[PDB]
């Protein structure tokens, strides 16, 4: 430490036929990618989306994560996680902070980008498909402690913290354009995604096949259910339990030969599974919204 947390993006619009946005900032006279520090209570994806909008005028849908860049600054170390971000429209107007934005194909953007780490990010971007759909696998938020009773406490609810995580997850799941909601047949799973359900005004599909008991009883039915959900149109959120997620994630990653750059399994965490034509092309583990 001290680590100053930030996030940014390769903002793109219509493989390597797309155009990407490169910005110019007067204060530093640099050509780079949009990025900015996280505000109080923001996560990286929420900050990336916000900074794309504030600097370029565009709204966007985040997809694949593109790695991390660190460099020293007087306060310590700046850390920047980057996402591919598909433009959903907007218009750039110059300001004091960013006076120019150019939309360039990857090759010319490579030439325009002055920092080696930005070119490294853009190399990662072109490495895989960027027109992806997304499956968000979420482990439910904190819900106190398991009781002494055998098995699972079906009705045990989120605790105060878990409720806050559920609220903070709305903005992070919307940053990836979540559209449809699923939770394992436990109260704490449904409660984690209820604030998002309110915000989209949508129903949560119940998933008894994805509880810990059912995964332990019939792991192949769970796996098959996950792929059925993934196959539906739209970007599903699936909220389940700690003994389920690692095994489903490691199975999908191993069969699609996809390497996660980070890994964890914390309550309130999210896995961002990027799909192109049904093949897994990214698996990005995001910390709980109130952890680093």
Ligand X SMILES: Nc1nc2c([nH]c(=O)n2[C@@H]2O[C@H](COP(=O)(O)O)[C@@H](O)[C@H]2O)c(=O)[nH]1
Lookup result for tokens 């069969």: 255
118: left (phi over 0), alpha (psi -120 to 50) or beta: alpha
Q: Is 54 within any annotated ligand binding site?
A: no
Query: Quick check: 32 binds ligand G8D (CB under 6 A)?
Result: yes
Alpha-helical (H) ranges within 175-271 are 187-200, 212-217, 219-231, 245-256
Report CA 168 to chain centroid distance, whole Å.
13
Stretch that binds ligand X, among 109-117, 185-193, 220-228, 275-283 (CB under 6 A): 109-117
Binder of ligand G8D out of 44, 51, 118, 207 (CB under 6 A): 118
Measured from the CB atom, the residue of 6 and 138 that comes closer to Mg ion is 6
Write the binding mask 52 to 91 for ligand G8D: x where contact by CB under 6 A, - elsewhere. -----------------x-x-x----x-------------
- Which of Mg ion, ligand X, ligand G8D, none binds 117 (CB below 5-8 Å, type-dependent)? ligand G8D
Binder of Mg ion out of 11, 12, 36, 87 (CB under 5 A): 36
Query: Quick check: 218 binds ligand G8D (CB under 6 A)?
Result: no
Measured from the CB atom, the residue of 30 and 131 that comes closer to ligand X is 30
Q: How far apart are CA 61 and CA 160, in angstroms?
A: 30
Count of all residues that appear for the chain in the document: 292
**CA dihedral over 37, 81, 180, 142, signed as positive or negative:** negative
Stretch that binds ligand X, among 110-118, 165-173, 253-261, 266-274 (CB under 6 A): 110-118
Using alpha carbons, select from 173, 190, 277 the residue that is nearest to residue 230. Answer: 277
Residue 134 CB-density burial (10 A; 0-12 exposed, 13-18 middle, 19+ buried): buried
Q: Is 51 within any annotated ligand binding site?
A: yes
Rounded to a whole number of angstroms, the minimum distance from the CB of residue 31 to ligand X is 5
Q: Is 177 within any annotated ligand binding site?
A: no
Helix (H) or strand (E) holding 137: strand 133-139
CB atoms within 10 A of CB 91: 8
Q: How far apart are the first and last CA of the chain?
A: 12
Write the binding mask 3 to 32 for ligand X: x where contact by CB under 6 A, - elsewhere. --------------------------xxx-
Contacts with ligand X, residue ranges (CB under 6 A):
29-31, 111-114
Contacts with Mg ion, residue ranges (CB under 5 A):
36
**Which residues fall in the annotated binding site for substrate?**
25-28, 30, 35-37, 71, 78, 97, 115
């Amino acid at each position: 430490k001290h680590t100053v947390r930030a996030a940014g993006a390769v903002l793109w619009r219509d493989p390597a036929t797309v155009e990407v946005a490169v910005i110019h900032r007067p204060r530093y006279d640099d050509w780079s990618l949009p990025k900015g520090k996280l505000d109080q209570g923001e996560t990286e994806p929420v900050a990336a989306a916000r900074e794309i909008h504030e600097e370029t005028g565009h709204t966007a849908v985040l997809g694949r994560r593109l790695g991390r860049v660190t460099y020293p600054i007087p306060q310590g170390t700046k850390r920047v996680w980057y996402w591919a971000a598909k433009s959903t429209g907007g218009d750039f107007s110059p300001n004091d902070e960013v006076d120019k934005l150019v939309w360039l194909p990857v090759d010319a953007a490579m030439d325009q980008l002055q920092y080696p780490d930005d070119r490294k990010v853009l190399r990662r971007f072109v490495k895989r498909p960027v027109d992806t759909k997304t499956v968000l696998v979420v482990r439910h938020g904190t819900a106190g402690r398991r009781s002494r009773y055998k098995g699972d406490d079906r009705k045990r609810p989120l605790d105060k913290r878990g409720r806050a995580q559920a609220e903070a997850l709305v903005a992070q799941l919307m940053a990836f354009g979540a559209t449809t909601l699923y939770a394992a047949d436990r109260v704490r799973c449904h409660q984690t995604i209820e604030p998002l359900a309110q915000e989209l005004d949508q129903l949560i599909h119940n998933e008894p096949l994805l509880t810990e008991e059912a995964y332990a009883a019939d792991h192949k039915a769970a796996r098959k259910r996950l792929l059925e959900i993934a196959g539906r149109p739209g970007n599903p959120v699936i909220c389940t339990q700690g003994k389920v997620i690692p095994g489903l994630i490691e199975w999908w990653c191993e069969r699609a030969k996809v390497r996660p750059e980070t890994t964890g399994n914390r309550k309130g965490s999210t896995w961002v599974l990027s799909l192109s034509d049904g093949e897994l092309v990214g698996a990005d583990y995001l910390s709980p919204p109130d952890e680093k």
